[PDB]
Amino acid sequence: ADDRCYRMCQRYHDRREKKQCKEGCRYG
């Protein structure tokens, strides 16, 4: 799930870290 893995990114305060973690999940 894209939302499942993405939810973990929300834990990161660094917006830049959330992006990499988000997109990184898809097409991995």
Euclidean distance between CA atoms 19 and 23, whole angstroms: 6
Domain that holds residue 9: 1-28
Q: Are the C-beta atoms of 26 and 2 separated by less than 8 Å?
A: yes
Distances (CA, A) of 23 to 3, 7, 8, 12: 11, 12, 12, 14
Domain count, the chain: 1
Which amino acid, one-letter code, is at 19? Answer: K
Residues in the chain: 28
Euclidean distance between CA atoms 23 and 1, whole angstroms: 12
Euclidean distance between CA atoms 19 and 26, whole angstroms: 11
* Structure obtained using: NMR
Euclidean distance between CA atoms 18 and 28, whole angstroms: 15
Burial environment of residue 21 by CB neighbours within 10 A (0 to 12, 13 to 18, 19 or more) = middle
Q: Are the C-beta atoms of 18 and 10 separated by less than 8 Å?
A: yes
